[PDB]
Design a protein around this ligand. Sequence first.
Ligand code: COA
Ligand code: COA
Ligand code: COA
Lengths: 200, 200, 200
Amino acid sequence: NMPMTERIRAGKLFTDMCEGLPEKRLRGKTLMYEFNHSHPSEVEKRESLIKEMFATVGENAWVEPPVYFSYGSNIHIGRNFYANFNLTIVDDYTVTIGDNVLIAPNVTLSVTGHPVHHELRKNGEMYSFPITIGNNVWIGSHVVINPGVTIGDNSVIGAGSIVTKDIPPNVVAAGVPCRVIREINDRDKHYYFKDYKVES
Amino acid sequence: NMPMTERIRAGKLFTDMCEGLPEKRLRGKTLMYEFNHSHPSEVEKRESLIKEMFATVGENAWVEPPVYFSYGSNIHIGRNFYANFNLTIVDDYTVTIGDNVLIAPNVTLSVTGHPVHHELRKNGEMYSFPITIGNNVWIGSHVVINPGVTIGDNSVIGAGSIVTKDIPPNVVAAGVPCRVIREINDRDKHYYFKDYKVES
Amino acid sequence: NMPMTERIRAGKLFTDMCEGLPEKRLRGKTLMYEFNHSHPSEVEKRESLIKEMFATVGENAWVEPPVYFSYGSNIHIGRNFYANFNLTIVDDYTVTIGDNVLIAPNVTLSVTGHPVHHELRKNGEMYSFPITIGNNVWIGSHVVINPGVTIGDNSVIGAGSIVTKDIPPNVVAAGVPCRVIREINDRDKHYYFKDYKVES
Ligand SMILES: CC(C)(COP(=O)(O)OP(=O)(O)OC[C@H]1O[C@@H](n2cnc3c(N)ncnc32)[C@H](O)[C@@H]1OP(=O)(O)O)[C@@H](O)C(=O)NCCC(=O)NCCS
Ligand SMILES: CC(C)(COP(=O)(O)OP(=O)(O)OC[C@H]1O[C@@H](n2cnc3c(N)ncnc32)[C@H](O)[C@@H]1OP(=O)(O)O)[C@@H](O)C(=O)NCCC(=O)NCCS
Ligand SMILES: CC(C)(COP(=O)(O)OP(=O)(O)OC[C@H]1O[C@@H](n2cnc3c(N)ncnc32)[C@H](O)[C@@H]1OP(=O)(O)O)[C@@H](O)C(=O)NCCC(=O)NCCS
């Protein structure tokens, strides 16, 4: 006897078929549908749905439909946020993105997991831990960010990464599981790609 | 002497632009279309389309649109099935899923593949080997399951896994390619995440 | 610096909010919307759009909706092209696909990337390097192909690989990051999958 809602915040196992959760979900997923199916020319429309879908959205935010979430109202986005096609966020709990964050296509964030033992999840039980994307972070394509992960500022996450651990700031991380490939140093102020110098 | 119908069943190479296959594909993608572009409030309709779309569906099935498949009628689902956003199932041949199966967002299932040799696929020839998912299986995000793969009951597939070989029951598997990581023991019956236990 | 469209062609850092780039994108995303939302029965309309969406498309092209791209007009496709669901192509610059190329579902092609050093991207500045996919290439599901990569003729990219470097022709590459597994020999002329021969 503890409201599901309060079990989420406590990191306890819960289910979401009650206490107004389903109604919340239908509100968000309703806005999601008119965004996702809006005509590319309906820019103002899209512009308001964004402010509308997420609990928090800074200025100069852009999201290439389609976009997917469970609620929408648990996603708090910062300034100048760009997200490319198919950004999926399972926001059963807090998801926070800093400023000037760039998100490539087909990225997946999820504060939710299921107990490994199929007996702790007989009724699709879940747990939720907040994700936190720092400022000036860049996430490559097909990246997956798992429950309770924090990505430090100005860091980069390579395409295909499966982030399962916290990622410090100022690094470059990649792999399955995602691991720190390396620190970003002055050479990166000159070389922006493979063998290409900033001064051509 | 053997139709393409019999070739698929036999595991032999084939092509699907005859024997009514194309027309079969159209019927399924038509219901698929209606399902994928349905309003979140069209609850009844969504439920009826599901029992329509797939060959078999057990009680309490839930698929979060959009869903993608080739025929849909080659897929058999057990009971209490929950698939999140963008489940993709290339079912040129039979796909069987058990009960209490949980599928995270952006998961691709595929019974189909193509000869490695470009000489064998001059006309895009393929082979199809059924996929079999046990009961109480949980599949992480961005996981891909290749042709003829069998996942043993109660097993867990970590996010981003690329499954090319059969997974035994009662295991936690992950990686690229997927490798059995450990056995699911009774220590999992208390712990569900890092160091979070369960009390009375 | 110098004009934005030039920086592109020169592999220099650029932003795309001028020189008519946004409008160019709107026509693209417009034809894209018309394609993605078409009905499975509207085959003739789907074919006109294919020819209209991309710069060049050889005969026999088939693209299963939905398909995603930035401009569309920066894509050149050969002949007997086949792409399954959710092909995403960030064609900020040229993307060339040869003949008899088969693409599995959920593949992402991006000629664009961002300077890893945040100071070099304050205004989400990016670079773009063409992508060249040879003839008779087969790309598996959930593959990601990064900027300026060349996939040789007759090669195969396993499901889930993250292709960061060029792939030689006649090989089988897979992995994160993608690495050459072996060369396509003549045994591949008999065995097409795990242990199945052609005549026996
Ligand atoms: C992360 C990235 C920018 C490269 O990091 P970088 O330091 O400048 O690149 P490097 O090639 O020097 O990386 C060094 C090593 O890491 C490997 N590596 C790079 N990216 C990797 C990735 N995503 N996953 C795994 N390994 C990766 C390289 O293959 C290389 O191998 P080696 O050490 O054996 O030689 C690039 O790999 C990438 O993924 N970009 C994302 C592109 C994208 O998704 N764009 C979308 C546009 S919005
Ligand atoms: C599979 C999963 C549950 C972890 O298994 P677990 O046994 O409880 O986790 P562990 O951290 O103890 O795993 C042990 C090792 O495997 C690695 N690992 C875990 N998941 C991995 C994955 N998906 N791919 C590759 N490696 C993985 C860990 O990084 C760790 O590395 P180490 O041995 O060097 O220390 C987790 O990785 C995962 O993928 N969860 C899915 C969440 C999700 O998709 N939720 C959405 C539901 S709607
Ligand atoms: C690439 C592919 C055809 C297999 O290559 P193949 O030579 O005939 O297969 P093999 O099993 O002999 O490959 C050898 C090794 O590479 C590994 N491997 C195969 N595919 C891999 C992949 N995609 N990523 C990483 N490793 C892979 C195998 O696990 C194996 O491991 P081992 O050397 O320890 O034994 C297959 O893995 C694949 O990815 N097919 C794509 C299927 C798909 O997406 N189809 C949809 C089409 S509509």
